[PDB]
């Protein structure tokens, strides 16, 4: 219908994929999941 | 912290050798000591960091008239340990008299192993009551550890002689060694021949080779009790802080030891806690109730189930205790060992003080008294005569264990401002 949300449907599929790639780029490359259990490992006495 | 196994008795040396081969299979090590290629974690609780990453186990072998050292000699476990730690009767009094004359060099062995370790905190004993050579020599070693080291721990993983009334000299020896364990040892983990033998006949189809499977059971129990010390958790990994919660009553330091897999060949923590509080899963043999309970769960565990399990266990009144304080059931978590060769990695353990063990102690309080009245089973050995002329040490042991019974029954009461 008349709206600017018909334009976004073949574009938001790439924008959301870029966002998911950013979060996965955090986890599997910068090891963001290991950093939580590393700071835990000294700050709530987990060593 | 770091503890050194002092094995004594025939079954004590058997469970010591079984414990070291169990830890050799458990850790990623060779039977020479060399680190493997599938093995950072801590390997410093029982092993010295020796020469080529040789995790040499720190142990003391004591006996009389050697039997099992030949089986050690023709095995690859004379190449894992023994850089010089192996030292070469049938009654408590003969063992006491034999340990009296050679107390100097065995105390030198204890000093040598204490100097060998890097942080001495306790002396753990892998011992069998009335194993033959263990009786008497073990009690004298306990007296030596109490006199020389009041600042360190004495831990005793031990089996106690119950045959359901076999041998007619073992109640005297076990009662005297039990009095020595009360006055000269700091914590006792109690096990029984009938309980382990009955569970062995239940889970398997054996009755005659009880010793070789009792070695496996005691080794699994000892590895489970030291799993959180050997492999790093972050709760009370020193022995002092771990046994600090385990003993609620300062004279009643005999702990129940259950194990939810009887054979290790899914489940929630609620179901294994309901299993684990039942005495049929416990390898230990009126109003009886616990004083304080603690359990350790290691495996593929979800921690919010440890929450809900603790909630439902204490509220449905299956943790049975009437204390003189607030002393309660405790949850504890452990990490299951990486590179166990064992499958089915969910396993549970309980360390709790129960007054029901007093009834089993009362059987020994019967037996010696019965064998004192018939007077053909004290046997009138001359070593017992030179131990004590009046034979009042056995009456002293009976008095001490009678105080222990009255202290169990007073700990059932909400008052411990009065015991008998």
From Swiss-Prot, chain A:
The entry sums up its family as follows: Belongs to the TUBGCP family.
Task: Return the protein name.
Answer: Gamma-tubulin complex component 6
The disulfides recorded in the entry are none
Q: Which disease is it linked to?
A: Microcephaly and chorioretinopathy, autosomal recessive, 1: A syndrome characterized by microcephaly, cognitive impairment, underdeveloped retina and choroid, and epilepsy in some patients. The more anterior parts of the retina, near the periphery and pars plana, have a grayish hue and diminutive vasculature similar to retinopathy of prematurity. Visual impairment becomes evident during the first year of life.
Task: Tell me the compartments it is located in.
Answer: Cytoplasm, Cytoskeleton, Microtubule organizing center, Centrosome
- Entry function: Component of the gamma-tubulin ring complex (gTuRC) which mediates microtubule nucleation. The gTuRC regulates the minus-end nucleation of alpha-beta tubulin heterodimers that grow into microtubule protafilaments, a critical step in centrosome duplication and spindle formation.
Subunit text: Component of the gamma-tubulin ring complex (gTuRC) consisting of TUBGCP2, TUBGCP3, TUBGCP4, TUBGCP5 and TUBGCP6 and gamma-tubulin TUBG1 or TUBG2. TUBGCP2, TUBGCP3, TUBGCP4, TUBGCP5 and TUBGCP6 assemble in a 5:5:2:1:1 stoichiometry; each is associated with a gamma-tubulin, thereby arranging 14 gamma-tubulins in a helical manner. Gamma-tubulin at the first position is blocked by TUBGCP3 at the last position, allowing 13 protafilaments to grow into a microtubule.
Curated annotation (Swiss-Prot), chain B:
> Is Glycosyltransferase among this UniProt entry's keywords?
no
How is the protein altered post-translationally, as described in the entry? Phosphorylation at Ser-119 by BRSK1 regulates centrosome duplication, possibly by mediating relocation of gamma-tubulin and its associated proteins from the cytoplasm to the centrosome.
Coiled-coil zones: none
Q: Name one GO molecular function term.
A: microtubule nucleator activity
**Which InterPro entries does UniProt cross-reference here?**
Gamma_tubulin, Tub_FtsZ_C, Tubulin, Tubulin/FtsZ-like_C, Tubulin/FtsZ_2-layer-sand-dom, Tubulin/FtsZ_GTPase_sf, Tubulin_C, Tubulin_CS
Disulfide pattern: none
Tell me a GO cellular component.
cytoplasmic microtubule
GO biological process terms on file: cytoplasmic microtubule organization; meiotic spindle organization; microtubule cytoskeleton organization; microtubule nucleation; mitotic cell cycle; mitotic sister chromatid segregation; mitotic spindle organization
Main location as per UniProt? cytoplasm
The subunit field of the Swiss-Prot or TrEMBL record says: Component of the gamma-tubulin ring complex (gTuRC) consisting of TUBGCP2, TUBGCP3, TUBGCP4, TUBGCP5 and TUBGCP6 and gamma-tubulin TUBG1 or TUBG2. TUBGCP2, TUBGCP3, TUBGCP4, TUBGCP5 and TUBGCP6 assemble in a 5:5:2:1:1 stoichiometry; each is associated with a gamma-tubulin, thereby arranging 14 gamma-tubulins in a helical manner. Gamma-tubulin at the first position is blocked by TUBGCP3 at the last position, allowing 13 protafilaments to grow into a microtubule.
* Homology family: Belongs to the tubulin family.
Q: Which disease shows up in the entry for this protein?
A: Cortical dysplasia, complex, with other brain malformations 4: A disorder of aberrant neuronal migration and disturbed axonal guidance. Clinical features include early-onset seizures, microcephaly, spastic tetraplegia, and various malformations of cortical development, such as agyria, posterior or frontal pachygyria, thick cortex, and subcortical band heterotopia and thin corpus callosum in some patients.
State the name under which the record lists this protein: Tubulin gamma-1 chain
């Amino acid at each position: 219908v008349l709206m600017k949300r018909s334009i976004t449907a073949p574009l938001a599929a790439h924008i959301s994929l870029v966002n998911k790639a950013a979060v996965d780029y955090f986890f599997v490359e910068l090891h963001l999941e290991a950093h939580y259990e590393a700071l835990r490992h000294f700050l709530l006495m987990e060593d | 912290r770091e503890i050194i196994t002092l094995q004594l008795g025939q079954c004590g040396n058997q469970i010591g050798f079984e414990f070291w081969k169990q830890l050799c299979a458990e850790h990623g090590i060779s039977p020479e000591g060399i680190v493997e290629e599938f093995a950072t974690d801590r390997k410093d609780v029982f092993f010295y960091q020796a020469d080529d990453e040789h995790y040499i186990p720190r142990a003391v072998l004591l006996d009389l008239e050697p039997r099992v050292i030949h089986s050690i000699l023709n095995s690859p476990y004379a190449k894992l340990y023994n850089p010089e730690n192996i030292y070469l009767g049938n009654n408590w009094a003969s063992g006491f008299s034999q340990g009296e004359k050679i107390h100097e060099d065995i105390f030198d062995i204890i000093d040598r192993e204490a100097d060998g370790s890097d942080s001495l905190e306790g002396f753990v004993l892998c011992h069998s009551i009335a194993g033959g050579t263990g009786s008497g020599l073990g009690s004298y070693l306990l007296e030596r550890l109490n006199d020389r080291y009041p600042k360190k721990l004495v831990q005793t993983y031990s089996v106690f002689p119950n045959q359901d009334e076999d041998v007619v000299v073992q109640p005297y020896n076990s009662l005297l060694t039990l009095k020595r364990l009360t006055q000269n040892a700091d914590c006792v983990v109690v096990l029984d021949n009938t309980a382990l033998n009955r569970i062995a006949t239940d889970r398997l189809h054996i009755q005659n080779p009880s010793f070789s499977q009792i070695n496996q059971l005691v080794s699994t129990i000892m590895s489970a009790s030291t799993t959180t010390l050997r492999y790093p958790g972050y709760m009370n990994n020193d022995l002092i802080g771990l046994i600090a919660s385990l003993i609620p009553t300062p004279r009643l330091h005999f702990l129940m030891t259950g194990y939810t897999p009887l054979t290790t060949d899914k489940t929630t923590v609620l179901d294994v806690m309901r299993r684990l509080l039942q005495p049929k899963n416990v390898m230990v043999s009126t109003n009886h109730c616990y004083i304080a309970i603690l359990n350790i769960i290691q495996g593929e565990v979800d921690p919010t189930q440890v929450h809900k399990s603790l909630q439902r266990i204490r509220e449905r009144k299956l943790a049975n205790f009437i204390p003189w304080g607030p002393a309660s059931i405790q949850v504890a978590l452990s990490r299951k060992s990486p590179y166990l060769p064992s499958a089915h990695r969910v396993s549970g353990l309980m360390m709790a003080n129960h007054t029901s063990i007093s009834s089993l102690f009362e059987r020994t309080c019967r037996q010696y008294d019965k064998l004192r009245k018939r007077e053909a089973f004290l046997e009138q050995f001359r070593k017992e005569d030179m131990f004590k002329d009046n034979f009042d040490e056995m009456d002293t042991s009976r008095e001490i264990v009678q105080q222990l019974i009255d202290e169990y029954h007073a700990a059932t009461r909400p008052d411990y401002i009065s015991w008998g």
